[PDB]
């Protein structure tokens, strides 16, 4: 089967900068009445792959011109004039002409910015929970920049790992930021046994970290 | 211009078969393109399945051996996928595609399906109201939250105040064990709109066709 390389893995671009991808097939794409069925697409964070370009050169319907592809044979490029923090996401090559059709493993596209440190909220487990059996202590991390984020619990001051959960979003084309998710399960036994709750998040934007806190049975 | 949207049952059991439609509208399936089914597995991986073209030609890929079937019904405009044999390594999110015939053009797909091919049982989410503490409420901003946890399978919907809060929030992705889901989901407001405009985490499990509105209650007198 064709197999199609996509380079680089990642990418980090500026807002307004070019950007640059390579995909390289291991046999050629031209077929036999003169067309070349590469195409290139886009698939946006939570969204469906989307046409860019096909035929190898030309511009699919509807996408804005400041996508180009280039190169003929087995090398192609995709070009982006000039990069648009919507433009985020993981770029496809595919090739139409050797049966089976296959696609590049993808590029990602990040969009560089200035650092953020992340906003930390810490809640409590609800009442209705309690009600359960367990308890659950959420802490949110939300539009940090760059992506790399530590997160450490404590119960009455001494560090917590197992019961530890995460979740990471994706970066947001709204500000170039990701976010976090950090979950501590306990049993209502547990959790109930104990006073203070604390998440500590460690980003590069502070040499200290940032600690939010908060007694049970204190609102 | 064609539209197209996958449906079929979201679960299925080890060694059954998965189905699924895709219904197009905007465009006859018996003209100009090739009616494909892609999916996506964990890590940007893309698979090509199969086609069925407009004139009712069909071609698979060799990976899915024997275990393919795709075929369509010119009176509902509507095609469909069969894989039999199915094991977790099945488990992916589903695409119908079209793409014409003449040049590999004007690619359309399908928002996507999730199948799982697991034996857990279907379960349905507890919704749980995240009020923030007393002293993080005194700036110009706050955040509040809900967690939706216990359920199988995925998707669940989460939306606040039914969709007309969109700004400021966060849905992060779901994570697995034992055979249950927890999510979460964030969203920040001025804070002196808070509590005179109500917020309410509005979820809903298609598969145990279950939904729950929860409405978050501040912390203290209510």
């Known amino acids: 089967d064709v197999v199609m390389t996509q380079s680089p893995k990642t990418i980090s671009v500026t807002i307004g900068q070019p950007a640059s991808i390579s995909c390289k097939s291991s046999?050629?794409?031209?077929?036999?009445?003169?067309?070349?069925?590469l195409n290139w697409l886009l698939q946006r964070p939570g969204q469906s792959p989307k046409r860019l370009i096909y035929l190898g050169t030309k511009l699919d319907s509807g996408v804005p011109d400041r996508f180009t592809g280039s190169g003929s044979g087995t090398d192609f490029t995709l070009k982006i004039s000039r990069v648009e923090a919507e433009d985020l996401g993981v770029y496809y090559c595919?090739?139409?002409?050797?049966?089976?059709?296959?696609f590049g493993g993808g590029t990602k596209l990040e969009i560089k910015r200035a650092d953020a440190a992340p906003t930390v909220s810490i809640f409590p487990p609800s009442s209705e929970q309690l009600t359960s059996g367990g308890a659950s202590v959420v802490c949110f991390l939300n539009n940090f920049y760059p992506k790399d984020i530590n997160v450490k619990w404590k119960i009455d001051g001494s560090e917590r790992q197992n019961g530890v959960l995460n979740s990471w979003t994706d970066q947001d084309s709204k500000d170039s930021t990701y976010s976090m998710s950090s979950t501590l399960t306990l049993t209502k036994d547990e959790y109930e046994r104990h006073n203070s709750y604390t998440c500590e998040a460690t980003h590069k934007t502070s040499t200290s970290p940032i600690v939010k806190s908060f007694n049970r049975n204190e609102c | 211009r064609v539209q197209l949207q996958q449906s079929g049952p979201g679960l299925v059991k080890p060694s059954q078969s998965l189905s699924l439609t895709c219904t197009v509208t905007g465009y006859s399936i018996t003209s100009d393109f090739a009616w494909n089914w892609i999916r996506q597995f964990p890590g940007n991986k893309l698979e090509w399945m199969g086609y069925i073209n407009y004139s009712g030609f069909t071609s698979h890929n060799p990976s899915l051996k024997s275990r393919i079937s795709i075929t369509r019904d010119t009176s509902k405009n509507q095609f469909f996928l069969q894989l039999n044999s199915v094991t977790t390594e099945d488990t992916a999110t589903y695409y119908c595609?079209?793409?014409?015939?003449?040049?590999?053009?004007?690619?359309?797909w399908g928002q996507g399906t999730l199948v799982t091919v697991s034996a857990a049982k279907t379960t349905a989410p507890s919704v749980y109201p995240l009020a923030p503490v007393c002293g993080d409420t005194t700036g110009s901003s706050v955040t509040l939250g809900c967690l939706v946890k216990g359920y199988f399978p995925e998707p669940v919907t989460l939306t606040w105040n039914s969709g007309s809060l969109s700004s400021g929030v966060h849905t992060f992705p779901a994570v697995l064990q034992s055979d249950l889901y927890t999510l979460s989901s964030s969203v920040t407001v001025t804070s002196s709109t808070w509590p005179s405009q109500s917020i309410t985490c509005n979820v809903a499990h298609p598969a145990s066709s279950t939904k729950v509105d929860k409405k978050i209650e501040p912390r203290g007198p209510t």
């Open positions: 595919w090739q139409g002409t050797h049966f089976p059709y296959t």
């Open positions: 595609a079209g793409l014409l015939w003449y040049d590999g053009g004007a690619g359309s």
């Open positions: 046999q050629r794409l031209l077929n036999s009445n003169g067309k070349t069925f």
